[PDB]
Write a protein that binds this DNA or RNA. Structure first.
Length: 60
DNA sequence: AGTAATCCCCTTGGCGGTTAAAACGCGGGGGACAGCGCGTACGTGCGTTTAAGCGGTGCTAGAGCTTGCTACGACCAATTGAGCGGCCTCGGCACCGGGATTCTCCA
């Protein structure tokens, strides 16, 4: 998945697309967040551990 | 019926500052501590006598155990209001300042 995601994210970013990724596991949000920091992608995160003001602002 | 995400809450950890409490220096005083002399008060030994300890005899109070039952507490279901959790407020206690009284110490 992460291989095919990395190809797809490259095709999308070269396309100028903007993307939402859904996870059933929040630990996969941690692992994915490492991969994103190890590449050029600016990103945001929401899950069930975030406080509500952080949800407000990250969506904004 | 199970296991994981979501979300509340409450505890731990960090950052800044501010200031009040801990640390540091130094003179001197007076209290700790070793030293001395005496004298009286406690340990010792003896002769005295006192009664604690032992072996023995006698009695009856009352500790200890069984029997019998009925009075009193355990248990349950229905009723209700006394007592708890939450919200409010105002008045008691603290906190400050300032002048008055007290206490301390060197003269």
């Amino acid at each position: 998945k992460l291989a095919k995601l990395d190809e797809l994210l490259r095709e999308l970013k070269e396309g100028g697309h903007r993307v939402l990724l859904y996870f059933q596991m929040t630990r996969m949000i941690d692992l994915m967040e490492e991969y994103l920091t190890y590449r050029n992608y600016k990103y945001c995160r929401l899950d069930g551990s975030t406080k509500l003001e952080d949800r407000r602002d990250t969506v904004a």
